[PDB]
Amino acid sequence: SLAPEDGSHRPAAEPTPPGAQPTAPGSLKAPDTRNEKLNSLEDVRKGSENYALTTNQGVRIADDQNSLRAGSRGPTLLEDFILREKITHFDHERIPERIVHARGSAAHGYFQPYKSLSDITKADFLSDPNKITPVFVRFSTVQGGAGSADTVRDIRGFATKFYTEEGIFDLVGNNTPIFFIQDAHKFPDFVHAVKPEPHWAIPQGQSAHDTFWDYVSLQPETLHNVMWAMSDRGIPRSYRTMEGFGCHTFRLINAEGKATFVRFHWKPLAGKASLVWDEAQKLTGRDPDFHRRELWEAIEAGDFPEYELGFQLIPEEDEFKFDFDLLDPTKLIPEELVPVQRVGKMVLNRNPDNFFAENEQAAFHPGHIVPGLDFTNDPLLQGRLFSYTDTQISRLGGPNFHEIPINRPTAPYHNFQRDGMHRMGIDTNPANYEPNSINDNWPRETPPGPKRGGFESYQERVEGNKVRERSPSFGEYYSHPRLFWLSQTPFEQRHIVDGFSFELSKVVRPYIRERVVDQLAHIDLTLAQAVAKNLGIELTDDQLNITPPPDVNGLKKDPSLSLYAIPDGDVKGRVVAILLNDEVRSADLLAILKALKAKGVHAKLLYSRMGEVTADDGTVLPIAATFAGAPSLTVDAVIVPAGNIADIADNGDANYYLMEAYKHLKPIALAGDARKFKATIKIADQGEEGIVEADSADGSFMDELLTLMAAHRVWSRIPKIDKIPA
Amino acid sequence: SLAPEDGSHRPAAEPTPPGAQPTAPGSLKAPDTRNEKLNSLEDVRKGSENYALTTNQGVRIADDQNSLRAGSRGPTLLEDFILREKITHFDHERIPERIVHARGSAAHGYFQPYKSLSDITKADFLSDPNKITPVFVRFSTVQGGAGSADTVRDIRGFATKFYTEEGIFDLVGNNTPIFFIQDAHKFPDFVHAVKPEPHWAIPQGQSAHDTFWDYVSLQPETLHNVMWAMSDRGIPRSYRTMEGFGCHTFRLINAEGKATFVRFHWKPLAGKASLVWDEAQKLTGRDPDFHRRELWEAIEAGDFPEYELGFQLIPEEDEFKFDFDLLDPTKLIPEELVPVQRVGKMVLNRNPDNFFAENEQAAFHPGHIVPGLDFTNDPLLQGRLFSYTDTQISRLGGPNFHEIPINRPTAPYHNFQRDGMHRMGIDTNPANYEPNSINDNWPRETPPGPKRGGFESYQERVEGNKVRERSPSFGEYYSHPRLFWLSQTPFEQRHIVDGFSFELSKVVRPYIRERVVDQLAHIDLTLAQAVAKNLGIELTDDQLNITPPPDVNGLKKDPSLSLYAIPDGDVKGRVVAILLNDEVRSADLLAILKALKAKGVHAKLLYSRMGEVTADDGTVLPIAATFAGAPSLTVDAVIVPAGNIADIADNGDANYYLMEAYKHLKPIALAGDARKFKATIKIADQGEEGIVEADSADGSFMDELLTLMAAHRVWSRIPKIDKIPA
Ligand code: HDE
Ligand code: HDE
Ligand SMILES: [S]
Numbered sequence A, B: 001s002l003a004p005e006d007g008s009h010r011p012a013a014e015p016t017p018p019g020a021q022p023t024a025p026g027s028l029k030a031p032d033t034r035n036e037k038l039n040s041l042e043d044v045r046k047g048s049e050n051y052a053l054t055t056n057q058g059v060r061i062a063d064d065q066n067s068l069r070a071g072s073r074g075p076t077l078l079e080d081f082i083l084r085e086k087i088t089h090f091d092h093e094r095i096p097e098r099i100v101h102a103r104g105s106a107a108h109g110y111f112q113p114y115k116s117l118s119d120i121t122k123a124d125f126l127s128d129p130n131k132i133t134p135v136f137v138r139f140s141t142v143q144g145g146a147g148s149a150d151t152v153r154d155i156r157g158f159a160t161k162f163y164t165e166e167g168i169f170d171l172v173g174n175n176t177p178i179f180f181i182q183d184a185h186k187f188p189d190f191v192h193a194v195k196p197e198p199h200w201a202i203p204q205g206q207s208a209h210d211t212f213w214d215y216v217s218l219q220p221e222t223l224h225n226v227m228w229a230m231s232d233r234g235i236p237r238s239y240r241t242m243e244g245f246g247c248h249t250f251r252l253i254n255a256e257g258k259a260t261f262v263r264f265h266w267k268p269l270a271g272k273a274s275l276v277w278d279e280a281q282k283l284t285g286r287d288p289d290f291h292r293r294e295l296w297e298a299i300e301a302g303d304f305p306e307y308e309l310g311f312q313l314i315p316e317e318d319e320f321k322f323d324f325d326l327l328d329p330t331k332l333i334p335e336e337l338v339p340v341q342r343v344g345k346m347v348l349n350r351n352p353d354n355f356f357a358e359n360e361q362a363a364f365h366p367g368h369i370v371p372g373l374d375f376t377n378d379p380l381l382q383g384r385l386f387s388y389t390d391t392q393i394s395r396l397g398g399p400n401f402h403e404i405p406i407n408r409p410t411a412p413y414h415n416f417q418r419d420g421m422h423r424m425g426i427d428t429n430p431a432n433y434e435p436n437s438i439n440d441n442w443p444r445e446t447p448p449g450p451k452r453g454g455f456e457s458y459q460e461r462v463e464g465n466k467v468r469e470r471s472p473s474f475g476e477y478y479s480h481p482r483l484f485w486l487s488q489t490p491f492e493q494r495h496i497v498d499g500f501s502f503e504l505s506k507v508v509r510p511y512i513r514e515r516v517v518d519q520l521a522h523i524d525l526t527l528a529q530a531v532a533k534n535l536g537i538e539l540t541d542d543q544l545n546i547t548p549p550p551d552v553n554g555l556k557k558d559p560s561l562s563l564y565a566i567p568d569g570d571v572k573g574r575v576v577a578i579l580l581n582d583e584v585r586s587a588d589l590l591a592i593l594k595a596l597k598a599k600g601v602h603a604k605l606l607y608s609r610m611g612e613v614t615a616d617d618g619t620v621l622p623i624a625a626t627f628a629g630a631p632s633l634t635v636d637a638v639i640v641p642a643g644n645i646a647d648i649a650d651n652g653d654a655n656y657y658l659m660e661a662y663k664h665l666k667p668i669a670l671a672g673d674a675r676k677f678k679a680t681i682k683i684a685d686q687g688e689e690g691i692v693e694a695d696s697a698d699g700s701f702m703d704e705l706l707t708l709m710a711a712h713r714v715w716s717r718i719p720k721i722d723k724i725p726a
């Protein structure tokens, strides 16, 4: 026995808040959570307790500490098969990462619709509010490698595999409603431009380099998604607090054969929330795994990520009723024009057991549709259909990638396909072709119908010549960027300007920065002047006189485009740093934790060392982390209880903690003598909005702090931060 | 034409300092830097200017902006082969990354010996000081993926491929002289324990997690290399400023067949220098590509990385003359006992053209030796010899990885091996076996001899039974950790304590922390006590009474094991930040830049925005980056000239620049009214060692600053930084 006698090596198999226990594989941490897909993976789950260590051939190993040698200081012998198996498996552990979205984090859950949608789609998973469909969801960045950092500025992927009774449906979305380019033929161009440059393979996880901005300046169709990426949308607080979108118009097909155009939405029920850029960048350094960790810890604590699936629905006869083309994936459909209809709820409630086997090996692909859904001619979607099947032949080693356990349907699958590398299924059918008589033609085709029918494409009319041509209707590039900009709050606008400015400051060739500023002048003059000023660029008289693009279908803003214009805060699952001293006032701490508990807000107790300290009244307080070990970047607010403040008052790290949190617009609360820290962040004696202060930590002190947390950040503080050296 | 009229898109093909020009592929940046290997790659280099865009089959493309569709808003057609080839290639761009050392950065150069070594080795590349051998060198971290950050705390790899006239010799080393484990059979255990944990794949690029310290606590053989990793060895300033080691005793074999034991060394002619932990960690977020960038830019500037190759030579009859086993790779050979003989110099003078083709596909392997070298029974080297050939079969797709251009020998190669995936060589030999008559037995075996002979192993005597057993002589784990400890300066010792303390505070299971502290008590009580205090652990009476391990062959320290005990500073190729204002005193700047140029030190001119400012005398000064865009993390020292200081006096970012540089022990120099900044870093009116100040930037001011820079950091400042909130 190497485990400690008190059993403190094994995490509690029950919900526990972040940091309370070591994290564990999902089937050990939450054995009681189940769904149909988790149950079906049981055949390949492997345990360990009480088993002998063996080769992969089942031979027990006696000594796993030494190679076989001729004498104990001699050479290693070729006959050591146990060594060579073990090192050969090690030597071949890695598979190619995904060409894009290589960095991602995943969990299991389930989906249910609020009511049957049979009047608009025959898709089985949407036919009955009692039908529960297991899901597996992977969130991701786009540009960086599997080993890159989470809180980079980038677009985020949001891919859901629905294991339906009529096949796998993968909804392969992102956290913005559009993409940078119009036609799939340019995807390698755009992706090569944003990826590390090919001579030296720099930079990782960043669009802040010459080739990205060269491409953008030369391809104005990109400006809409670039506006999103440069906003705080590019730096979400959590995968739990971002929106998801299906990116294209698809179709729903009902049993009558009626097509309705649809765009897909995910609404985060935890609300929308983003970091600020200096915080996101610094966090890539202090914890490059912060989003993967926050997602896994949320599920272990029971703060299950929840999302509402929604549909924007457009009748077929309304195809041409807008100012933009519905097939143009650089255009959004404003919610003011077409509201999102709520469809159902998805909950993510179980982590995987083994990251490589369930996360790294999962394959999502938007061609994976089911009866009741269909495509459209969006020319970016159209090319996606080719890529997601193709790429798996190298990434997952061949055409049997659907036999890798996480990718297996739970629906029946039978057909005449055979062989390929890694073939698991042993087919007993006497036939491997159809039509056949020797197996009475089974498995058999199934006609389309209202349920459980075969897939048939909607009979869309096609007319035109074979051309490599962009539709003229896609040739408008500035109105949607302008609608987005005008929909932002003034502080969201400032952060857009600061994102273009920082990024273009990293472009070495100045003419590329000038060309991008020229494009901005076509969108909005105020935005363009503000960026130009930060770059030392002066707009020409011609630039100052560019007519702004038209409004989109009479709209001059749509508030659903803003993260923050309309409050949608939720504090459950947020975290507060509590800065301790060597003689904490226990009554303050009891009131702080009581109020945080009641709203499902977590806490981390921090000090200048590990171990414990003892409160004024003898209560032993266990320290979670040092000030330096768990920086303010990792929390949503900071509370300092009263007590022996002298203990930490001249501690550089403790003062800096509050300066960093202050700069990043987080709520800060100081009780009693902790008010002494007001001097480090230059707060006046009469106080200021966003700093909660009182003689003790209750009556209204925690209500005030929790009201600040529900509004996420203290935006009114922005003018005060440029003066603080932090 | 899309390029700017003024030609400013194209970097000059001359050496230029960092930031002066965009970086470029090495054959375009330095077209006349040549060596036998670079010239031999010309057969596969492809250019681009003035050529038409084609498929891979040579068909010219007319429209590389669109897919082929039926109508300009129609579906994409399967007959679009141009689209499918382009997206197929993109879909399969990625290959598996290296199992370990996936993150690395590489360059070309050459090696030449100082004298003939024929008396001790018949290796041809060491036979004459006129023998110039091309090299390709890849530096790397160990744990993180190819997209992880450079300035993590980790061991670093230093792998050199010598293209000799008698074969490739790969010297595949690290930046410490030992490894964590004794026997190759435990490599996958150790690497699994340091790598991200298997449930959730966290953390990236860090040993600061429970499974690493669990293994270390249970395997005290690891403690010696753990001491090195927790020292500032684990966070080098540059690949140019760290040592390399071949890790194992190999043999040199001379023409007479005499074997001498050898351990290999690389000594950096730029001297030894490392970051401090806070700076390294923050730098992973501010610039995760910092070491890759600094290496590429150094070579572009002509600050070519230079290392001296060195041998520790031990006669065969001296095998048992030490109190440790020469075959145990957890033991170092102290230079006080066996000096390093300096044998030649390697210079890296050219970056690659295409990172993936030359860096990512390069394969190094320590079994790639040449006549005049041989192995020993070191049980970690023995197992390595299996792994480095095996792993390439998945990583590089098959057994023809020596035909990938960067890997090809420049020496002749001819044999009877045939076929394999993507076989390039077309053999004309009528025979593919030997002995054969039908080609008169060619290519033929060559007997061993003094030059141009075949390889024959040294006829070492082997006597023993077939056993899986560790030599009892390997069973001592504490004397080398203690020697290394006692050889460090008092500030290097504090940084080791801090590295253990920070790492163990991130281990969630407290008994693992306790088990590590127990091991520390076996090494040195002062170290053990200092770590324990940071963790809130108290040593037991038994722990306080553990007898220290013995000295190593009577040594109680060896200053060659310290980074800084013996002065070894070189400022050429270092970089200073100069913080501008909107009316700079020009005389200060002329003097600063003149003195920096004379010593080969670079500068970066920083301000609050991009563009330019104008000095008091109307000199226009171009701005390289903002204060926030290029933080103090990225420079060796900071200089603030006089002028309109009030322009920046209340700039939070400018104040913080100096606070962060101060906290990180960097020299800071303040001229005239720039001395008003003393107040932000709490410098007394009378001054402080490490802060250069004068009325102006005269001759003595720069000499003082450059003297501080030769000493790298201001270690005497350490007691003052605890109070600084930065
Ligand atoms: C023609 C335009 C085009 C093309 C060709 C592609 N992409 Fe992807 N994209 C591919 C190609 C690849 C290369 O096949 C790849 C690489 C690995 C793989 O299996 O598929 C992939 C990954 C990917 C994920 C990760 C899924 C996971 O977590 O495993 C997510 C969420 C998205 N995508 C989302 C997405 C949207 C939202 C609408 C839009 C638009 C696009 N993408 C554009 C697009
Ligand atoms: C049994 C003990 C053992 C075993 C089995 C291995 N390692 Fe490695 N190591 C391998 C295995 C692999 C898996 O073959 C792999 C992974 C991909 C590959 O092709 O080779 C590899 C890479 C590697 C590089 C990068 C070279 C480059 O830039 O590509 C460097 C610099 C080092 N190593 C240095 C090193 C030292 C210096 C002493 C010592 C000791 C060891 N290692 C220990 C060791
Ligand atoms: S999209």
Ligand SMILES: [S]
Binding pocket: B177, B178, B179, B246, B247, B248, B329
């Ligand atoms: S080693």
